[PDB]
Amino acid sequence: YIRMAKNKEFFDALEEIAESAKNDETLRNELAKVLDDILKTDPSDPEAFRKIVAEHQEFWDEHDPSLMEQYLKSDDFLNSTDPTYNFQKLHQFAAEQRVKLGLEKSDTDTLVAILKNNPEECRAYIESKKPGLGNFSEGNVHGWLKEEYTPTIPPKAINKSTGVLSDEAIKRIKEQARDLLLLKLINSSGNTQLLKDLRDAMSKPEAERAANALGFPTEGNGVLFLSREVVDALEERVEKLEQEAAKRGFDSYVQSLSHNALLAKKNGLESTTAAGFKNSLDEPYKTYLPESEWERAQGVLGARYLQAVLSSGTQNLKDALNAKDANALITELKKPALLGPHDYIDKAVTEENLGSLKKNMMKSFINNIKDETNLKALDALKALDGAKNLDKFKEVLGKLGITPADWVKDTDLKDMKQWARARQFELEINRVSSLGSGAHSKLMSTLTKLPVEKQREILAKPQQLRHLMNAYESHVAEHYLGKNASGIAELLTENKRLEGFRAIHNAEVARVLANFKPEITLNDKQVAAINQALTTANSNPNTYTQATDYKILIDAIKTQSGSVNQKDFYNAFNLNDDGRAFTSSTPRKDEMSKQQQHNQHIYAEYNSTSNSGNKKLLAVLLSIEKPVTFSKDIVNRFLRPLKDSETPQDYADTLFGENPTNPANKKFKDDLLRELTPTVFNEIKNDLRKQELLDTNPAHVMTAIKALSTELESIKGITGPIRTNADKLKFINDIDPVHLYNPTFQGTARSKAAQMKERYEGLSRDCGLVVDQLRRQVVALEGHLKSLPKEGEFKAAGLTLEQKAEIKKLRTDLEAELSAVREDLDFYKKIQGKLETIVKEVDVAA
């Protein structure tokens, strides 16, 4: 080797200078000449060549003096045959370097065309862009050949000048072109998913499609390879787009948030830095929101979170509802009792907020109205429901603790009275049900959706809430609710699910099992075994103080629920997670004990008796919560009058009174009539009328076989006339056609048919009545011959041939009526329907 020369030093200098001409527009115009000349020269003419490189000495000395030192013409300092850097190389390299300098600022269409064209076609293309990408025409640069052309049908210009722009040189030119075309495409795409497909690809075939979709050409794909410069710029483009996307989308997303969602953002909103705040959002905003937005976004999401948490909370809101302006409402909400000292609440701003906020705070207030010392809750609420003026309101909102209340609008008066009524219901159902008002969510909805007036009615007559919890067929609900009122379907199925718990043998186990987070669903055989578990528990004299014996009661129930987390079960009954021992704060078990202590004497009969009629009356009794212990003498006083009482109401009255004076009684009468439905009371009754029919005296058997036969004759006298009129009322209106008419009076052409309508729908309302009546008799008749044992297992001393032929007379007569009445029920319904189709053809006709 040697090296005593400037040949590398010029390669290396040109290369640097070209880089610094990226952003120095005049230096490129200088460096283009330096090249434009070096190019014009013949390479293999060491005189002429070194003449031309020397004759730009002023431009050489301008970058680096250490290129220059009679010695210029001497090829001592400048090698003519360097193994790595000739004149042939420094000409070839200066050509590459020329076209590279030119495309650095050239348009998208050129950039494409260089990628589009093959090396041959690419050289000829460079000639057509003259002097843009150098002066590459014949004669103007030495190596440069004549343009040849292909033999293809549309001929394509090619230039086979490898001596100056080598095949490896035009690849490097395409390399540089690609990059710049991409940066052009990247900086101009708003389409973020495409950009991402490119950055996140892991194989040429989708690096392709991603590129091709941005506008990179199909022809370029061969050389498509991400440099680290294009990557770096791509990566920082998406982060730009996502941020200004997320900044824009936020104010919408906040409005999109559900109530529970809003509520979950608290830890976020209280965050002392933007990282935290941001970390509590959902994923677009969780990262790509910019921190600059934060202070603003605290407010936008804040004032929605102030609406949500103030609306739904239990905190005391007197002072904050009485706030003077926003500035005072703020200093109130920052108080530790409320939302705490946090910057976010300094976006509860006077403008839109403190109206909106106070209306929302008023919902909380009303819902946490409490039996205070001078005022009942139901009075306070009904005061608010009652009053008519805005000023008649402010008068009571005086007494509730809100002065001035001059902020209270007129429009809102209807909304906030609904909150007053809704709350009234909440309480009145809590008063009526052993269970929670929560346990009747669907019932609590349907009342809140009855129109303004009916609400006030059902509230003035609260006893029907009782009847509604015992409404299981839609017509029963309708009779108290409305015509076809909203949400009945759901109400009924609530009542069907609750009946298990409502008839469970202890009111604590009722409450918690009914109000479990996943919903449980029972069979009667499940609740049998649950009530069986509680009898073993009442048998055990330390179920509620020995933790291993409290477990025997829970372990028994557990199994019957059947399918949930063990732990919540145990905690919800005040035990630790294991079972091992009681949790320190022990209220659920405490009331269980208080209940199951009152079921001492009641259980004492429940176990003794074979009277599987009034077993059921005890079962309902111990399934109702009691203030007090219910002695052995009151169990006797409960069981006495049931035989002689005909209805549930007549049963209550003779126990307690017409309007029993003593509050603790009045409540238990109300609570007793809730569980003694007309339906279950009959079940008790004709169960205990099985009893007198199971007796060992024929004295008693027959004294109740005759009774029963008297009630059958009653039933036959209601059915009698309904039978004799039946054959008549059909034969007339069954063969009857329905295009026709019957005109027999005066009036208008349309009012003839209209009042012949009134006459048919009069008959439709007679049949309906009959239908209802026969419905009751089939229920009754069934009721009776359930009560009758069946030729066998009579468990009685000798029955004579007249006695045993009389009881068999009864069965057959009972079944022979039941069977018979069905004829008519069927038939009367046919006539029912038959009219409905005649009445609604007079509608479409007249």
Closest CA to 293 of 327, 253, 330: 253
Tokens of 394: 């402010």
Tokens of 429: 């159902």
> Looking at this protein, which amino acid is placed at residue 371?
D
Closest CA to 777 of 725, 715, 726, 706: 715
In 149-273, alpha helices (H): 167-188, 192-200, 204-214, 228-256, 259-264, 266-269
Closest CA to 389 of 410, 416, 418, 415: 410
CA 402/CA 394 separation, integer angstroms: 8
Q: What is the DSSP letter of 713?
A: H
3-state secondary structure of 162: coil
Q: What is the DSSP letter of 744?
A: -
Task: Please say whether the beta carbons of 342 and 269 come within 8 A.
Answer: yes
The sign of the dihedral angle between the CA atoms of 809, 811, 814, 816 is: negative
Task: Please say whether the beta carbons of 513 and 502 come within 8 A.
Answer: no
Per the DSSP assignment, residues forming a β-bridge with 158 are 148
CB within 8 Å of 722: residues ≥ 6 apart: 770, 773, 774, 824, 828
Tokens of 622: 């111990």
CA 232/CA 772 separation, integer angstroms: 83
Judging by beta carbons within 10 Å of its beta carbon (0-12, 13-18, 19+), is residue 795 exposed, middle or buried?
Answer: exposed
Measured CA to CA in angstroms, residue 222 lies from 171, 217, 229, 233, 275 at distances of: 11, 10, 19, 22, 44
Q: After what residues is the chain interrupted, C–N > 2.5 A?
A: 69
CB within 8 Å of 351: residues ≥ 6 apart: none
In our burial notation (b when 16+ CB lie closer than 10 A, e otherwise), range 248-266 reads: eebeebbeebeeeebeebb
Measured CA to CA in angstroms, residue 348 lies from 22, 300, 345, 358 at distances of: 53, 10, 6, 11
CA 753/CA 759 separation, integer angstroms: 10
Tokens of 67: 């290129």
CA 429/CA 441 separation, integer angstroms: 11
**CA dihedral defined by 594, 596, 599, 605, rounded to 10 degrees?**
-160
Peptide bond into 83 cis (omega under 30): no
